[PDB]
Design a protein around this nucleic acid. Structure first.
Lengths: 192, 192
DNA sequence: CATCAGTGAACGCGCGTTCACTGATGT
DNA sequence: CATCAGTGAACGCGCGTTCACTGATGT
């Protein structure tokens, strides 16, 4: 229908809030009014799309989750090959961040600093990412010296490193992060 | 003098802002009014201590920096012994966090989410921590296969891991972080 | 008597939310 | 005529900041 325009306006509010953040400001500090101002609706017109700012926040988590998971599926598609696994996936990853700066900006900025339902939605998307990593590694016996409990700890260290590297990939890398993921992988290989 | 009372009030504003954060809220979202309300002065009485909220933020970075560096000096004091280096220092560290929850809370929460001068003051304290780590490691030839450029990358990975572990050490560990730092150390040892 | 940390009233402003509304889309 | 996304005016409230002030500390 032309409730496609309703959707286009919802994307405007969303894209407007993310973009308003690219200046160091956090999602909790954004007013409904300024977001509507930026997106091109009069304040009360926010309520046709979200009940409040928190709800917009939640929709921003879902948007980035979807993008983050699409990238990791691309990385997952390359792990069945042999050699150069790290370099190739760092590249796939860095491209996806490049192509979606403001989404990963939101995630990097809110990963600890948001409201409650936003902190929780992020912790959740992160646990899934971590569980998927532990399941990838287990599948291909890529870390044989590591049992289920150890893989969980390993995958947590890798995801943590990635999440903690996001801020660096937006403000201003490839070789450095690759170098760093190697230290971790080497540590998993020679474990014991 | 009894400008010791002036200092006591300054500590109240400071401790008041940190503590007001323990509920998931970020420093940028705190009003001058609520901080004064919490600390026990009437709003305009903030200005005898700080020109604005940013300046309070800056003083909170300096406070935690000082505490963080005192902990790392304690960890540094144990690195000249042999064996069990990781376990002992994780313990020293976790105690210092325990003893200063709200300070590390501020740091963990603002490490990426604050204003500009606050983001910059934190990046600075972090670079110093990282440089000190790279200098410790170099001093004791603890990572012989690593040249100056490699140590910088290694120390960045360790500090990043620590900073990224802070949120977990306040909201709700020892074995997990120790386990994780081992993967990293092993990776540094067997590098090449 | 001198200093000055903290007071208490006042201001103008942007906020979130409500409400009856308008007018194009889709029957 | 029916739906409903977006309008525009209005409200009460908490904000940051100013100002002349008070009264204990320290001369």
């Amino acid at each position: 229908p032309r409730a496609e325009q309703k959707q286009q306006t919802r994307h405007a509010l969303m894209s407007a809030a993310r973009h308003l953040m690219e200046s160091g400001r956090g999602f909790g500090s954004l007013s409904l009014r300024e977001v509507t101002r930026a997106a091109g609706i009069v304040p009360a017109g926010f309520y046709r799309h979200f009940s409040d700012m928190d709800q917009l926040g939640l929709a921003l988590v879902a948007e980035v989750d979807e993008t983050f998971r699409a990238t990791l599926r691309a990385v997952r598609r390359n792990e069945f090959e042999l050699g150069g696994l790290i370099d190739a996936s760092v590249r796939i990853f860095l491209d996806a961040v490049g192509a979606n700066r403001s989404q990963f900006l939101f995630l990097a900025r809110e990963q600890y600093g948001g409201s409650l339902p936003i902190r929780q939605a992020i912790a959740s998307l992160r646990q899934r990412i971590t569980d998927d990593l532990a399941a990838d590694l287990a599948l291909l016996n890529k870390m044989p010296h590591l049992d289920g409990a150890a893989l969980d700890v390993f995958a947590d260290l890798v995801v943590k490193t990635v999440f903690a590297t996001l801020p660096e990939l937006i403000d201003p890398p490839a070789a450095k992060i690759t170098h760093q993921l190697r230290f971790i992988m080497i540590g998993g290989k020679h474990w014991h």
